[PDB]
Structure formats: structure tokens, C-alpha cells
Design an enzyme around this catalytic site. Structure first.
Site, PDB file in Angstrom:
ATOM      1  CB  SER A  44      -0.963   0.024   1.167  1.00 40.61           C
ATOM      2  OG  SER A  44      -2.102  -0.777   0.890  1.00 40.61           O
ATOM      3  CE  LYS A  47      -4.450   1.502  -0.453  1.00 43.72           C
ATOM      4  NZ  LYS A  47      -3.838   0.293  -0.922  1.00 43.72           N
ATOM      5  CB  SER A 104      -4.326   1.130   4.012  1.00 44.10           C
ATOM      6  OG  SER A 104      -3.368   0.757   3.030  1.00 44.10           O
ATOM      7  CD  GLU A 140      -4.293  -2.734  -3.197  1.00 45.67           C
ATOM      8  OE1 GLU A 140      -3.479  -1.890  -2.731  1.00 45.67           O
ATOM      9  OE2 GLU A 140      -4.280  -3.953  -2.922  1.00 45.67           O
ATOM     10  CB  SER A 211       0.435  -4.800   5.453  1.00 45.33           C
ATOM     11  OG  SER A 211      -0.874  -4.573   4.978  1.00 45.33           O
TER      12      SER A 211
END
EC number: 3.5.2.6
Length: 262
Positions: A44, A47, A104, A140, A211
Site C-alpha cells: 500500500s 497509494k 489504506s 488491488e 502490508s
């Protein structure tokens, strides 16, 4: 090998995994790197690039952040803490950016990717700001597979620190956009156990965690100590076992070593 490098190497050895660190001290433009040119899965942390790329679009499309975006059931993926609250409704691109960065939210990230025309639009923004290393290949949730040796969805610590500097302290974004990114990063809700936990409690921090599989545990941060020039710190960590547990403590410990190392 330097004193800070020896402590980071020791932390890594104690951890069983692979640690990557890049610090930029903007006072003198000095750098500390540990595995700084190795690739790591971003998870993440990517992002930030997607949110920044949308912010860049908003420099021409001045009201872009107000644009409503529908959240449909088919859009929900594996981790949608904010978007779940708006299924069958809409969220603005500002609200999606905040959800992606501060919680997230993976549906929010996919909406940013779509706004940019696919993952290639995120990579393109990286290239346009001088980052030749970052690559986003997937949406994702599959961008988090974090498979050893897979170059997809990776960057290096050196490159990500340089980019994070340019996006926040530098002027890779317009003035309102840079300030908006800084506000979003400072308001992150997921970082308490990562870099922030290793730093003097009087330092202001903006960060984005990541993560993934292989126990991949990451954090990228801009750090405003006081009365000393800001720092940029990237800490990436990944492990040999696909099902390894998160190790946010390693990131806190790397930050503590870097902070003690100045």
C-alpha cells in the site's frame, strides 16, 4: 560500512527478513541507505503515488477532487474500511484519496488507478516526476502478492525516498496539491506502530504504511523534527515465508536507529 549501517544490518539479522532503508536529510542532502537499490514490494505504499498522480491531474482539472465516484458492490475488494460505508452511493476523489492514504482502503486505491487510466497511469506519473524505478503493474488486491524476486509492483528505497521528498517537500505537485498531500500523510491512521513508534514523540510525521504477503511490512514517511531540517525515511521489510506475520516493530526499530544515527 557505517555505524548506522552496522546497526541496521544487526536489526535485519535479528529479524530473519530483508530490510531496506533510505533516509534523506534535507539539511545537507545527505543520505543513509541500507539495501537502498534493491527492489521491494511496495504494497500500500504505492497509494502515495496514485493519490499524488490524481492531485497532479487536479492542477489542470481544478475541481477534480470534488468529482463523485460511484462505489458499487463489484468494486469492493479485500479491504474496504471506508468504501464499504458508501456502497451503492458515491465518494469524491478527495474522499477516496483520504481513504486510500489514511486507512489504506483498497477499493479507494482502485478508484484512483481507474481515474488515472490503469496502473500504467500511476507509473507514468512516477516517470514524469523523475522516478525511473517505481512500477505499478496490477490493481488491488493482486499488487500485494509480494512474491520474492517478482519485479511487479516494486520500487527501491532510494527511489521512493527521493520521490516522497519531491512530492511533499519539493514541488513535483502544485502548491495546494503538495499541501493537501502533506495534510493527508500527517493524518494517517495506520502508522502508530511503524516509523512513528521509533521516533522522538516531538517530531511531526506524515507517513503511509504497507502490508502484504511474505510478511511484507513497509512505511514511508516525511519527518519534521524541532528546529532542524526535515527528513525523508523509507523502511521496507519482507520475509522468507509466504504466510509470515507482520513486523511493524522492525520499522520502528529502523527509525529509532536512524534517529539515533544523526
Amino acid at each position: 560500512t557505517s555505524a548506522v549501517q552496522q546497526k541496521l544490518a544487526a536489526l535485519e539479522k535479528s529479524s530473519g527478513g530483508r530490510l531496506g532503508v533510505a533516509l534523506i536529510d534535507t539539511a545537507d542532502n545527505t543520505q543513509v541507505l541500507y539495501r537502498g537499490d534493491e527492489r521491494f514490494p511496495m504494497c500500500s505504499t504505492s497509494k502515495v503515488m496514485a493519490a499524488a498522480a490524481v492531485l497532479k491531474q487536479s492542477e489542470t482539472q481544478k475541481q477534480l477532487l470534488n468529482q463523485p465516484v460511484e462505489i458499487k458492490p463489484a468494486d469492493l475488494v479485500n479491504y474496504n474500511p471506508i468504501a464499504e460505508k458508501h456502497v451503492n452511493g458515491t465518494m469524491t476523489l478527495a474522499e477516496l484519496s483520504a481513504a486510500a492514504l489514511q486507512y489504506s482502503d483498497n477499493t479507494a486505491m482502485n478508484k484512483l488507478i481507474a481515474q488515472l487510466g490503469g496502473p500504467g497511469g500511476v507509473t507514468a506519473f512516477a516517470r514524469a516526476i523523475g522516478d525511473e524505478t517505481f512500477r505499478l503493474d496490477r490493481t488491488e488486491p493482486t499488487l500485494n502478492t509480494a512474491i520474492p524476486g517478482d519485479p511487479r509492483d516494486t520500487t527501491t528505497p532510494r527511489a521512493m525516498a527521493q520521490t516522497l521528498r519531491q512530492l511533499t517537500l519539493g514541488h513535483a505537485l502544485g502548491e495546494t496539491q503538495r499541501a493537501q498531500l502533506v495534510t493527508w500523510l500527517k493524518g494517517n491512521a495506520t502508522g502508530a506502530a511503524s516509523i512513528r513508534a521509533g521516533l522522538p514523540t516531538s517530531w511531526t510525521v506524515g507517513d503511509k504504511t504497507g502490508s502484504g504477503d511474505y510478511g511484507t511490512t513497509n512505511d514511508i514517511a516525511v519527518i519534521w523534527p524541532q528546529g532542524r531540517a526535515p527528513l525523508v525515511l523509507v523502511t521496507y521489510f519482507t520475509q522468507p515465508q509466504q504466510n509470515a506475520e507482520s513486523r511493524r516493530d522492525v520499522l520502528a526499530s529502523a527509525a529509532r536507529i536512524i534517529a539515533e544515527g544523526l
